[PDB]
């Protein structure tokens, strides 16, 4: 009486929603993970929702040679 998935895929899906709701919708929620991983970030780019840059978690050492500053030397003390 229970439908078979590989012969009639859609009929099985309706039965599982109605007769095994906890198992069926776990698979549906579990599959929404990958679905939003494919839809939203492309969607967000189009609307202009840009990703924030990472915050610094270490001292941000400036790239390049040292600037050769002249100021606040020892003669400036006192």
Partner 1 sequence: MSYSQTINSLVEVVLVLVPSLVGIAYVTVGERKTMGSMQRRLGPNAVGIYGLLQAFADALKLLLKEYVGPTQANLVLFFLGPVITLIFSLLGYAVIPYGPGLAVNDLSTGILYMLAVSSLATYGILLAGWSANSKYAFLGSLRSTAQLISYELVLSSSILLVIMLSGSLSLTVIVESQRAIWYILPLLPVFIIFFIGSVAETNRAPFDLAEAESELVSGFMTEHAAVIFVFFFLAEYGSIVLMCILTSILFLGGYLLINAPTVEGSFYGLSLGVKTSILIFVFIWTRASFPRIRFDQLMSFCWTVLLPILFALIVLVPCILYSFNIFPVNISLL
Partner 2 sequence: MATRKPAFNQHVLLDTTPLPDSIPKVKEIGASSAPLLSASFFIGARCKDYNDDYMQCKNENPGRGEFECLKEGRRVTRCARSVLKDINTHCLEQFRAHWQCLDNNNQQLWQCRPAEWKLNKCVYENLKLEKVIPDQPKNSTPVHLRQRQIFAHHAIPPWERPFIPGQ
Partner 3 sequence: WARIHLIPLLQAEEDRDHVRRYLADQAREKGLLGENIKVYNSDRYVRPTFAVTPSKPAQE
Query: Under the criterion CB under 8 A, does residue 17 sit at the interface with partner 1?
Result: no
In the range 38-57, which residues lie near partner 3 by CB under 8 A?
Answer: 56
Residue 25 as a binder of partner 1 (CB under 8 A): the answer is yes
Q: CA 43, CA 49: separation in Å to the nearest integer?
A: 9
Distance CA 40, CA 46 (A): 10
Q: Which of 38, 50, 52, 69 binds ligand CDL (CB under 6 A)?
A: 38
Sole binder of partner 1 in the list 10, 23, 47, 61 (CB under 8 A): 23
Q: Per rule CB under 6 A, is residue 54 in the interface with ligand CDL?
A: no
């Amino acid at each position: 009486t229970t439908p078979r998935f590989w012969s009639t895929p859609l009929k099985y899906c309706r039965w599982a929603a109605r007769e095994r709701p906890a198992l069926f919708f776990s698979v549906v929620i579990g599959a929404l993970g990958p679905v939003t991983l494919a839809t939203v970030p492309p969607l967000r780019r189009l609307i202009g929702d840009v990703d924030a840059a990472p915050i610094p978690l270490t001292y941000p050492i400036p790239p390049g040679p040292r600037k050769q500053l002249k100021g606040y030397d020892d003669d400036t003390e006192d």
